[PDB]
Design a protein around this ligand. Structure first.
Ligand SMILES: *[C@@H]1O[C@H](CO)[C@@H](O[C@@H]2O[C@H](CO)[C@@H](O)[C@H](O)[C@H]2NC(C)=O)[C@H](O)[C@H]1NC(C)=O
Ligand SMILES: *[C@@H]1O[C@H](CO)[C@@H](O[C@@H]2O[C@H](CO)[C@@H](O)[C@H](O)[C@H]2NC(C)=O)[C@H](O)[C@H]1NC(C)=O
Ligand SMILES: *[C@@H]1O[C@H](CO)[C@@H](O[C@@H]2O[C@H](CO)[C@@H](O)[C@H](O)[C@H]2NC(C)=O)[C@H](O)[C@H]1NC(C)=O
Ligand SMILES: *[C@@H]1O[C@H](CO)[C@@H](O[C@@H]2O[C@H](CO)[C@@H](O)[C@H](O)[C@H]2NC(C)=O)[C@H](O)[C@H]1NC(C)=O
Ligand SMILES: *[C@@H]1O[C@H](CO)[C@@H](O[C@@H]2O[C@H](CO)[C@@H](O)[C@H](O)[C@H]2NC(C)=O)[C@H](O)[C@H]1NC(C)=O
Ligand SMILES: *[C@@H]1O[C@H](CO)[C@@H](O[C@@H]2O[C@H](CO)[C@@H](O)[C@H](O)[C@H]2NC(C)=O)[C@H](O)[C@H]1NC(C)=O
Ligand SMILES: *[C@@H]1O[C@H](CO)[C@@H](O[C@@H]2O[C@H](CO)[C@@H](O)[C@H](O)[C@H]2NC(C)=O)[C@H](O)[C@H]1NC(C)=O
Ligand SMILES: *[C@@H]1O[C@H](CO)[C@@H](O[C@@H]2O[C@H](CO)[C@@H](O)[C@H](O)[C@H]2NC(C)=O)[C@H](O)[C@H]1NC(C)=O
Ligand SMILES: CC(=O)N[C@@H]1[C@@H](O)[C@H](O)[C@@H](CO)O[C@H]1O
Ligand SMILES: CC(=O)N[C@@H]1[C@@H](O)[C@H](O)[C@@H](CO)O[C@H]1O
Ligand SMILES: CC(=O)N[C@@H]1[C@@H](O)[C@H](O)[C@@H](CO)O[C@H]1O
Ligand SMILES: CC(=O)N[C@@H]1[C@@H](O)[C@H](O)[C@@H](CO)O[C@H]1O
Ligand SMILES: CC(=O)N[C@@H]1[C@@H](O)[C@H](O)[C@@H](CO)O[C@H]1O
Ligand SMILES: *[C@@H]1O[C@H](CO)[C@@H](O)[C@H](O)[C@H]1NC(C)=O
Ligand SMILES: *[C@@H]1O[C@H](CO)[C@@H](O)[C@H](O)[C@H]1NC(C)=O
Ligand SMILES: *[C@@H]1O[C@H](CO)[C@@H](O)[C@H](O)[C@H]1NC(C)=O
Ligand SMILES: *[C@@H]1O[C@H](CO)[C@@H](O)[C@H](O)[C@H]1NC(C)=O
Ligand SMILES: *[C@@H]1O[C@H](CO)[C@@H](O)[C@H](O)[C@H]1NC(C)=O
Ligand SMILES: *[C@@H]1O[C@H](CO)[C@@H](O)[C@H](O)[C@H]1NC(C)=O
Ligand SMILES: *[C@@H]1O[C@H](CO)[C@@H](O)[C@H](O)[C@H]1NC(C)=O
Ligand SMILES: *[C@@H]1O[C@H](CO)[C@@H](O)[C@H](O)[C@H]1NC(C)=O
Ligand SMILES: *[C@@H]1O[C@H](CO)[C@@H](O)[C@H](O)[C@H]1NC(C)=O
Ligand SMILES: *[C@@H]1O[C@H](CO)[C@@H](O)[C@H](O)[C@H]1NC(C)=O
Lengths: 478, 480, 161, 292
């Protein structure tokens, strides 16, 4: 009970958000499952429990004077991001929604002016811009690219996202299970216009995007499609996040196996997880609910003697029928005006989501992204477009670091009165000897003149250790 | 009086603008910055009178572009800027039957023939109230774990006491967030309830303290995967490396950078405590919501053409079938006012949702990383930023690198040596008049031109503007 | 004819409805006039109807050891057009609804704050347009001027300056 | 009109043109630095050299092709005026907003002549031949009809003002990240690798002239991810290993300039037995003929 105290009416607990009856108050916190309000959330141990939500597991990271944690491994992972781009192109008829087949109330409808024409123009503008949203998202290639007939990608498997020739609709298994996951009025003068791009043509656009990115990298989104070997493409996508390309050429089989496992978990997660297609089910449910209340508002009287127009025109002559006619036209007209207003407010949100989806297509699919948490959690490498009914699904392949060691560091190394700073990466030490490794992977190297640069002397940096910087020039001359 | 030509009618002195004409202000001939806008380039107190002027757009500065001259700063200032974005509103909910139809079964029986309008408006306000908590969770709940600061504050001279929460103050807030809560200032009527937010004000601050502890402890690695700790001079060194400055600049100027950071952080509290209307983007949200509610209550006093606005008063002295049409005018007027309120709240909720999407984007791309995009996380080259909790919003403290104290140097595209064209690997060639050096672009650091900071391609007959100098080969003193 | 069969009076049945007056062709073109459901629509003295072609097909020759390194480039300038503002209009509610008549104005004041709410909303729109224009264009603290000698290394800017 | 007024904008077209002229003089004389701190002067070849360096092309490509790049830039700039003069409906995004606003204003004017159930639509005639206590409801039908039309117009202008505010936020973002700097975001400042952008004043809008780098002519070459040399594997420090058929070269990815594979051009990591599909060649150490 929201806005009351617990003084007015099996267990009664007082919350800040109101009086809650039926839930036991448990002291320890959990992750929030059903929100109530003011931090209190709510089944566990065959009873309804009430608790303050937990904000995540709490850990204190061991901040030290001189230590960096650097990963020794990595887990490449694929995350799904699901964004709606369009709605149903609905359009109504003014005189058939308000009146129907009656000229003697059509003459009273012409006394209201262009109230038909404004709502028809607004719904026509929505129906034009919903095709513009789909064109702006999916129509980003100049040319339709096709996959090679053999699939030798260095170990990488793409059969879950490439379209299947055995399928009669020419779709991938992931796109097919996206089509089989969502479930979906045209009676009194309201029509549903079909979209300009059908689902086969949208799947052809996503297949052109997919074949273009696995064949070319980011070059086809910029200029002409320049072909690449796909391990060399993934190595150059490692080279944009701060990992050198030798890590992939030593760990290519592990990268391909972890990528195929992470891709194969996507179909299982979308098949098993309930309400995974929530943002695409919600727009269809909202459009169907608005359409259903648009149909259902004809049954209202609006102060008239009957909701059906035909019997009151059958049982009253016009100079006292027109009082009931004007009330029915006023109620149905302002109901339709309310519907067009809520559809415009919803279409602005769908326009913003389609702009976000086109932006995420442009700098997650067509290129590589340096802005973090925009193309998935972790260091982004590339992503996969997947078509969806009134939406688009991005399969964000990201670089997530695995297990790490804690080490000990120093920001500079003094050698013969000269302070040496690393060019790429940092100095690390495992207790005795010092090495140079990159930041996102533990690849320790001997400190040389090649990977370090010198600036100033050893009195300006507040923490310096003393080691020997070994150049190859002295042994290759001696 | 806009849109008139005042040859027709206080009358002190009259000047004719293009936005109408203005009466009571003296037209000066010199231009200043626009203080009070009027329209068509005219702005409006100075020298004991209200003045009117064509605006001055800015101070004119023709920078000395030349044939072969470049400008490289020998110093820098670190500036902290504040950006204030609202993320949420008050979750209001209106009971339609109690609002238009207070405790009358006669209006309720008159209201059941209007249909599902009240549950439609209740569904719209319920979707707004779900959307506000979704906006708050998308802005603040972006970290998977709650991170904690170490009990010793050894950050290499960097002082975070203004930004980290203080246990001496209640509900664990920083002084900056406490002064934000003291500078943002916030009843129960018929049919109106205010739903509380799901995330409370002491506990949004726990997300901001977790993000601050994770940022200060680990750089951006907590936003990518597991939180990998780093010393904070090493973190700020690689954030200096993200904007084209070499790492040795902070390691030779660390006390100056720490003092500039502490002074710039300490000026933030004084600036947003002494500057009025700095929190206007948060104040106008609360003022617009409370003013929309006050208009919604105030339209219950309207008669709408009836004999009186009180339903029991127009039932108490009238018969039922004329009291029907006296009630029905009040029902359609108050229902039209309620739909107008729900429509304006939906447009304002769309604006708040767009601002919250911008705030979550700025949180992800300034707090959980470092942005190479210009002016998205403050003016200047962005280093790092600090989230701070706010009433119905978030305040970002964008720490940016700003160059300062520049000097002219005479530059060249390439340097000819032994018939070969030398191009700089990182940076440019500069000269102070006699000798040539290689510096990085964002800081003056002159170095001797060697073969490990230049690269060789082509000859000297193809590059326009190539100069001649020597390139020091490091094999020469060992060969000699 | 939107969403009907072709039984109620050349004839071409589409998914979007019954199309009368446009001939159907087998081969595809780039879409000119949108019809819906992959159909688009003048060529050879008649109105044609065709299935959309999304582009030209390009099987890029993938191999496991083949690179296409560009040996040359081009410098392309494209135009992008974005609106920033609209006209700051405003309506007076009394003069619009209720022109020069106090005997309507005394019953228009019985409706409450409806027509000052509309004036406040359009006032907020008119304030918002100048904020939009200032936020887009006013991004410099100083007014910069080009030098009078246009020695830009061969780059011509007279179409832009 | 009757009650409708149009307020002029605060910034006139000369002041918007002076903002764009200040932005253009700032970006031409200083690159990207005037949006960060003070405007620091730089020659425009060295400015275009760093803007080439941001997209993986070394500065020597511009310094050997400066006349060709300037001629291509001048041809592409001169194509803009000819395309905007000869191609209609390129400014349709600026035409539709003033068409929608004037059309909504014309609809708001044309709803004054509507009856809404009255005996006449003009106020003065139904006032002048009727008594007030019978004429009050006769006025009040026109009152509620014109009020409903006015709040409909205000709702349409609120939704359209939200759309124009979103477009203006996009235009301010594109100004700050395409004009005031160089963007690595793909397809945000034009098709291709973005170099720099030019704002231009427009009636109720802004036109960006995005200068992009598009590759033109490519050739096939055979790759190898590493080069074997006496048991060591050499990986490219920057760029790609290419071969014309007989000999192997290092070139960068966005332009073809072959150099000899040296020890200062590659780095050593591991051995040849772990990396799949690599070839054998020679990596020349430059100090060996110097001591020999
Ligand atoms: C690196 O070393 C630090 C301290 O030597 C480790 O921090 C401790 O880890 C143990 C693990 O069993 C905890 O019980 C202690 O409470 C931690 N102490 C502090 C002060 O946090 C750290 O875990 C090590 N890192 C790794 C990756 O092993
Ligand atoms: C890095 O992590 C991978 C797994 O993510 C490790 O690979 C596993 O190694 C064990 C060794 O016995 C095998 O049994 C597993 O089957 C491997 N898993 C996979 C998916 O291949 C790898 O060993 C780790 N490397 C280091 C250096 O820690
Ligand atoms: C690429 O992945 C697909 C899907 O995992 C592989 O298809 C499987 O092939 C095996 C035969 O060895 C069957 O037992 C599975 O049932 C297939 N899976 C499905 C979902 O049909 C395919 O073999 C892989 N390609 C390669 C070259 O290994
Ligand atoms: C760099 O040098 C130039 C000239 O050496 C300086 O430009 C002069 O600035 C003054 C300031 O009003 C003008 O009066 C001169 O006419 C300018 N001369 C030329 C040739 O342009 C410029 O100020 C110097 N910049 C800095 C930062 O010191
Ligand atoms: C961080 O800055 C605050 C603000 O100046 C410092 O707090 C001051 O501490 C000294 C004692 O060392 C007091 O005399 C001042 O009155 C304090 N100022 C305020 C405003 O309270 C704080 O000490 C600094 N942190 C560190 C580690 O030096
Ligand atoms: C790269 O492309 C440009 C433009 O297509 C070439 O420049 C043309 O070269 C031919 C012959 O060399 C001349 O007839 C044209 O007048 C040039 N056009 C322009 C606009 O300058 C250039 O030669 C190409 N580079 C290479 C190496 O082939
Ligand atoms: C830069 O380009 C413009 C292009 O308009 C050149 O201006 C033209 O020059 C010719 C030669 O005298 C005149 O006939 C045209 O009337 C000029 N056009 C305009 C619009 O003024 C200009 O000469 C070029 N600058 C340089 C240095 O080559
Ligand atoms: C790189 O090699 C491929 C294959 O050797 C070339 O692709 C051929 O292009 C011609 C052009 O009409 C087609 O007729 C052939 O059918 C293509 N071959 C295959 C196997 O698809 C490609 O053109 C070469 N690249 C360049 C720049 O010449
Ligand atoms: C309102 C609230 O939170 N708690 C109230 C408390 O203040 C009051 O003293 C008590 C007696 O009825 O009832 C409960
Ligand atoms: C930390 C450390 O050992 N620093 C040494 C210092 O003690 C010594 O005096 C100097 C040479 O005299 O070299 C350095
Ligand atoms: C009050 C005043 O000084 N007004 C001057 C006017 O005298 C002068 O003729 C004009 C043109 O410069 O500018 C203004
Ligand atoms: C004009 C000027 O500053 N010239 C100096 C010169 O005096 C000095 O000897 C040299 C370094 O050796 O650097 C340069
Ligand atoms: C501008 C200048 O002096 N350029 C010289 C040139 O005169 C000389 O012939 C050549 C050979 O050393 O070196 C260079
Ligand atoms: C819950 O905690 C409070 C204080 O921490 C304590 O008084 C109370 O007994 C606890 N309840 C249960 C069921 O343990
Ligand atoms: C590390 O700690 C010591 C003592 O705890 C301190 O003197 C020193 O300044 C610290 N910082 C370094 C070495 O950077
Ligand atoms: C305004 O009045 C002046 C005074 O005669 C006249 O010159 C001018 O043309 C008028 N402007 C308009 C727009 O009527
Ligand atoms: C840079 O500016 C600071 C101002 O705080 C000053 O203390 C410092 O000496 C300057 N450095 C140089 C090299 O001029
Ligand atoms: C400087 O200008 C002169 C012409 O006045 C020109 O000959 C010379 O090449 C220019 N120098 C450079 C470096 O562009
Ligand atoms: C139209 O009518 C024919 C005649 O039976 C039928 O075969 C066809 O399926 C109908 N098409 C539609 C779309 O109803
Ligand atoms: C289209 O193709 C079919 C299949 O053979 C053929 O019968 C028909 O005549 C063709 N129509 C045209 C216009 O070419
Ligand atoms: C390949 O490059 C080598 C090295 O310059 C050259 O000698 C040879 O002629 C080239 N072959 C072809 C076919 O271009
Ligand atoms: C590329 O494919 C061919 C198949 O003809 C195979 O012989 C070769 O080993 C492959 N190379 C690599 C690096 O996978
Ligand atoms: C490269 O060298 C190794 C050892 O000398 C040899 O086993 C291998 O076959 C060589 N590769 C080729 C392609 O001949």
């Amino acid at each position: 009970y929201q806005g009351v105290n617990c003084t007015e009416v099996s267990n009664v607990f007082q919350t800040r958000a109101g009086c809650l009856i039926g839930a036991e108050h448990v002291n320890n916190s959990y992750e929030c499952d059903i929100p109530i309000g003011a931090g209190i959330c709510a089944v566990a141990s065959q009873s309804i429990i009430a608790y303050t939500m937990s904000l995540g597991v709490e850990n204190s990271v061991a901040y030290s004077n001189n230590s960096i944690a650097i990963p020794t491994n990595f887990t490449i992972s694929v995350t799904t991001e699901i964004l709606p781009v369009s709605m149903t192109k609905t359009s109504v008829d003014c005189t058939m929604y308000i009146c129907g087949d009656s000229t003697e109330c059509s003459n009273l409808l012409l006394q209201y002016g262009s109230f038909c024409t404004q709502l028809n123009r607004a719904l026509t503008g929505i129906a034009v811009e919903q095709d513009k949203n789909t064109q702006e998202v999916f129509a980003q290639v100049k040319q339709i690219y096709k996959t090679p007939p053999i699939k030798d990608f260095g170990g990488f498997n793409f059969s879950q996202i490439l379209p299947d020739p055995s399928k009669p609709s020419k779709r991938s298994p992931i796109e097919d299970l996206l089509f089989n996951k969502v479930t979906l009025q045209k009676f009194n003068g309201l029509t549903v216009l079909p979209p300009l791009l059908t689902d086969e043509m949208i799947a052809q656009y996503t297949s052109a995007l997919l074949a273009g990115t696995i064949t070319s990298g980011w070059t086809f989104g910029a200029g002409p499609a320049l072909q690449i070997p796909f391990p060399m493409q993934m190595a150059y996508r490692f080279n944009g996040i701060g990992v050198t390309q030798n890590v992939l050429y030593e760990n290519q089989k592990l990268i391909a196996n972890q990528f195929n496992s992470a891709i194969g978990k996507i179909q299982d997660s979308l098949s098993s997880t309930p309400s995974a297609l929530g943002k695409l089910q919600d727009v269809v449910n909202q459009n169907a609910q608005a359409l259903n209340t648009l149909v259902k508002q004809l049954s209202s009287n609006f102060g008239a003697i009957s909701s059906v127009l035909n019997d009151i025109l059958s049982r009253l002559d016009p100079p006292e029928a027109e009082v009931q006619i004007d009330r029915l036209i006023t109620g149905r007209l302002q109901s339709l005006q309310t519907y067009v207003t809520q559809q415009l407010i919803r279409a602005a949100e769908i326009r913003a989501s389609a702009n976000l989806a086109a932006t995420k297509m442009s700098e997650c699919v067509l290129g590589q992204s340096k802005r973090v948490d925009f193309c998935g959690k972790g260091y982004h490498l590339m992503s996969f477009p997947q078509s969806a009914p009134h939406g688009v699904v991005f399969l964000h392949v990201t670089y997530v670091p695995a297990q790490e060691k804690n080490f000990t560091t120093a920001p500079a190394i003094c050698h013969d009165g000269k302070a040496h700073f690393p060019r790429e990466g940092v100095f690390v030490s495992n207790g005795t000897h010092w090495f140079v490794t990159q930041r996102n992977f533990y690849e320790p190297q001997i400190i040389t003149t090649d990977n370090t640069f010198v600036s100033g002397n050893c009195d300006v940096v507040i923490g310096i250790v003393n080691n020997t910087v070994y150049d190859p020039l002295q042994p290759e001359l001696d | 009086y806009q849109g008139v030509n005042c040859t027709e009618v206080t009358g002190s002195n009259v000047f004719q603008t293009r936005a109408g004409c203005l009466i009571g202000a003296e037209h000066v001939n010199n231009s200043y910055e626009c203080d009070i806008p009027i329209g068509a380039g005219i702005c409006a107190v100075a020298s004991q009178s209200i003045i009117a002027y064509t605006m001055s757009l800015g101070v004119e500065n023709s920078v000395a572009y030349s044939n072969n001259s470049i400008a490289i700063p020998t110093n820098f200032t670190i500036s902290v800027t504040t950006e204030i974005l609202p993320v949420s509103m008050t979750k209001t909910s209106v009971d339609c039957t109690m609002y238009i139809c207070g405790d009358s079964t006669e209006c309720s029986n008159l209201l059941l023939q209007y249909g599902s309008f009240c549950t439609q408006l209740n569904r719209a306000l319920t979707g707004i109230a779900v959307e506000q908590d979704k906006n708050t969770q998308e802005v603040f709940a972006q970290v998977k774990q709650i991170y904690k600061t170490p009990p010793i504050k050894d950050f290499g001279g960097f002082n975070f006491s203004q930004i980290l929460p203080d246990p001496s103050k209640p509900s664990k807030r920083s002084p900056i967030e406490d002064l934000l809560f003291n500078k943002v200032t916030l009843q129960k009527f018929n049919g109106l309830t205010v739903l509380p937010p799901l995330l409370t004000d002491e506990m949004i601050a726990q997300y901001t303290s977790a993000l601050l502890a994770g940022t200060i402890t680990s750089g951006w690695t907590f936003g990518a995967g597991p939180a990998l700790q780093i010393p904070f001079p090493m973190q700020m060194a690689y954030r200096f490396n993200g904007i084209g400055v070499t790492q040795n600049v902070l390691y030779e100027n660390q006390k100056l950078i720490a003092n500039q950071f502490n002074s710039a952080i300490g000026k933030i509290q004084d600036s947003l405590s002494s500057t009025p209307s700095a929190l206007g983007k948060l104040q106008d949200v609360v003022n617009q919501n409370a003013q929309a509610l006050n208009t919604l209550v105030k339209q219950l006093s309207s008669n709408f053409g009836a004999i009186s606005s009180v339903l029991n008063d127009i039932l108490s002295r009238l018969d039922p079938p004329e009291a029907e049409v006296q009630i029905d005018r009040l029902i359609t007027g108050r229902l039209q006012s309620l739909q107008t309120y729900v429509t304006q709240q939906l447009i304002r909720a769309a604006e708040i949702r767009a601002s919250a999407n911008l705030a979550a984007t700025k949180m992800s791309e300034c707090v959980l990383g470092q942005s190479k995009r210009v002016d998205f996380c403050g003016k200047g080259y962005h280093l790092m930023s600090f989230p701070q909790s706010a009433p119905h919003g978030v305040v970002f403290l964008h720490v940016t690198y700003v160059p300062a104290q520049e000097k002219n140097f005479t530059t060249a595209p390439a340097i000819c040596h032994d018939g070969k064209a030398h191009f700089p690997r990182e940076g440019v060639f500069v000269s102070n008049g006699t000798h040539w050096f290689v510096t990085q672009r964002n800081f003056y650091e002159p170095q001797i031109i060697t073969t490990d900071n230049t690269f060789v391609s082509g000859n000297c007959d193809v590059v326009i503007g190539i100069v001649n100098n020597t390139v020091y080969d490091p094999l020469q003193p060992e060969l000699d």
